[PDB]
């Protein structure tokens, strides 16, 4: 059963600490090339990654002891889950660990869109004083649409409520009565689009949420809507967003995530009304430490049944 | 009733200034010949002015304070200066909150990186606000608005105001402490005071010396409350991890050392630059006038 675990990426020593406390032997490697990793996994039931180490069908297939792969983070981009499940290898991740960091970044993106803070800093650093060029928006009394009312969507809701934003939204699993208890009014999507000043997505990436925002939904929005995607690349159709930015149907967007990372296509990043980060939603010392801890705790519970 | 308007004003304010007499002409970029013979005045931004002026009763600035109109020359004549001290409050508080989130996650620096074709995930390791301490100096309209918003993020809000009682500030969840007890506790410090002798260099080498190593500071209030030489020294040592500045001792600033620092976020004094603030000030000034 589960004994010895390799850590192949850099995450807080709180991870190692909890693993050995629960009986597991631990080793701690870093970077490691496609050939390198497998020579460690010779003797290992367990592999903990962050984002850098790719766990492809190759490593999975070529590693003849590996029973579980743990990601100290959200989703499994860097783990071939098709090939893992084929070989009976359990894949786990730490969904709770990043919630607050992702919600805080989303709120900062909304403030940034409202007041053009990234654009203003760039203008100051270019030696300009362009007070006129900037006219921002007060959030108080504006409507924020929240698509997805799990962990992150509800944390975004309660913070933006403090700004006196009205928070409306939709989730197919969360009842209107439960969303009401954290101040989010659920309506049909067709009724959400024309009410929103700001839209933010907090859904998993599924067929049903791939291009959730598209040409059809932008057609239904108020002119000048502002969009945030701090969830997963492709929930917002990037073509449809660029078309909405060019027409003015969309007055601005804030993107932490892209269909391709890093993105080869530069048109959205380069747009004047787009502010962007290189997938920083989970990039806080606090989230990184909580994910380290959460994966270790998940591992030890599997040894104790 | 001839009324000049020496500033980019909200078009609501003219559509207002025809309840009572108001013969208006909104001429920006001015200079002094403009106000020929006019008795009752409105302004936004932009003395020698009123001295060569004639029959003028009330001057009104759609904004807070009067830092673009000589109050003593106006007191040298009969002239009452009105302003709209609540019109800009929410917009200034909202910008301050956005500056706090930008300092925590370096969103302006991340955007500049991305627009250079970079994908810099390690440089941009940030801080969670939940569980951090925000020090708020000045607990008037703006300070209390910043406090209740940042409490929703799980920040502990402490502060100091010589005029606001500890009971008033406890009612909006701000614990007042002596300044000496505030500095060592703060992860973030934000200033919401008037610019007075007592508040000029309120943050200086002596106060940075008592702060936590890595404190972040915001000034969306008035240029000079943060001593700019002291703030650059603190950024240079790492005593200050970052600063967000909407305001500068000289606007526009000719000393570029702070604006050019990698850990400084800056705006060209945008705290009151929203449609809603500019509309609310245009009308709060009317009700002060049109209800003597
Ligand atoms: O007409 C329609 N076209 C397609 C469909 C609209 O698609 C949606 C599908 C959705 N799915 C979910 C969803 O799975 N929500 C749960 C929470 O209940 C959840 C689980 C995990 C996470 C996370 O990983 O952070 C987030 C949310 C929300 C959501 C919203 C919308 Cl608008 O309806
Ligand atoms: O030991 C000392 N070191 C320095 C010295 C004084 O420091 C202070 C002086 C202060 N003055 C005030 C102040 O005038 N506050 C009132 C609110 O009651 C106020 C009025 C208008 C506005 C506004 O225009 O938005 C804001 C606030 C706050 C404050 C804080 C501090 Cl730390 O004492």
Curated annotation (Swiss-Prot), chain B:
Gene: PHGDH
Residues given in the record as NAD(+) binding sites: 64, 141-142, 161, 193, 220-222, 246, 269-272
Alphabetically ordered keywords of this record: Acetylation, Amino-acid biosynthesis, Disease variant, Isopeptide bond, NAD, Oxidoreductase, Phosphoprotein, Serine biosynthesis, Ubl conjugation
Known partners and oligomeric status: Homotetramer.
Phosphoserine modification, residue list: 8
Keyword Transferase belongs to the record: no
Positions bearing the Glycyl lysine isopeptide (Lys-Gly) (interchain with G-Cter in SUMO2) cross-link: 15
Gene Ontology biological-process entries: brain development; G1 to G0 transition; gamma-aminobutyric acid metabolic process; glial cell development; glutamine metabolic process; glycine metabolic process; L-serine biosynthetic process; neural tube development
Species name: Homo sapiens
Residues with N6-acetyllysine modification: 15
Name this polypeptide is given: D-3-phosphoglycerate dehydrogenase
UniProt keyword NAD, yes or no: yes
Disulfide-bond pairs as recorded: none
List of residues that carry Phosphothreonine: 64
Described function: Catalyzes the reversible oxidation of 3-phospho-D-glycerate to 3-phosphonooxypyruvate, the first step of the phosphorylated L-serine biosynthesis pathway. Also catalyzes the reversible oxidation of 2-hydroxyglutarate to 2-oxoglutarate and the reversible oxidation of (S)-malate to oxaloacetate.
Known outcome of mutating residue 121 to W: In PHGDHD; results in a 2-fold decrease in enzyme activity with 3-phosphohydroxypyruvate, but no change in substrate affinity
Full-sequence range covered: 7 to 306 of 533
């Amino acid at each position: 059963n589960l004994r010895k675990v390799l850590i192949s990426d850099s995450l807080d020593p709180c991870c190692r600490k909890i693993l050995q406390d629960g009986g597991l032997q631990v080793v701690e490697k870093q970077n490691l090339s496609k050939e390198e990793l497998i020579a460690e996994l010779q003797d290992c039931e367990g592999l903990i990654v962050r984002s850098a180490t790719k766990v492809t069908a190759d490593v999975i297939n070529a590693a003849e002891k590996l029973q579980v792969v743990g990601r100290a983070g959200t989703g499994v981009d860097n783990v071939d889950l098709e090939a893992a499940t084929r070989k009976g290898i359990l894949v786990m991740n730490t969904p709770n660990g990043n919630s607050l960091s992702a919600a805080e970044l989303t709120c900062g993106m909304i403030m940034c869109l409202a007041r053009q803070i990234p654009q203003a800093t760039a203008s100051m650093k270019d030696g300009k004083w362009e007070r006129k060029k900037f006219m921002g928006t007060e959030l108080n009394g504006k409507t924020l649409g929240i698509l997805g009312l799990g962990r992150i969507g509800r944390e975004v809701a309660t913070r933006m409520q403090s700004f006196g934003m009205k928070t409306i939204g939709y989730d197919p699993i969360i009842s209107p009565e439960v969303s009401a208890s954290f101040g989010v009014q659920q309506l049909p999507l067709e009724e959400i689009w024309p009410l929103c000043d700001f839209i933010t997505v907090h859904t998993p990436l599924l067929p049903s949420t791939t291009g959730l925002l598209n040409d059809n939904t932008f057609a239904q929005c108020k002119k000048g809507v502002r969009v945030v995607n701090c969830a997963r690349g492709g929930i917002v159709d990037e073509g449809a967003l660029l078309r909405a930015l060019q027409s003015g149907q969309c007055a601005g967007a804030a993107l932490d995530v892209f269909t391709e990372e890093p993105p080869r296509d530069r048109a959205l990043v380069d747009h004047e009304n787009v502010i962007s980060c290189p997938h920083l939603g989970a990039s806080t010392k606090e989230a990184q430490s909580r994910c380290g801890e959460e994966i270790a705790v998940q591992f030890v519970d599997m040894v104790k049944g």
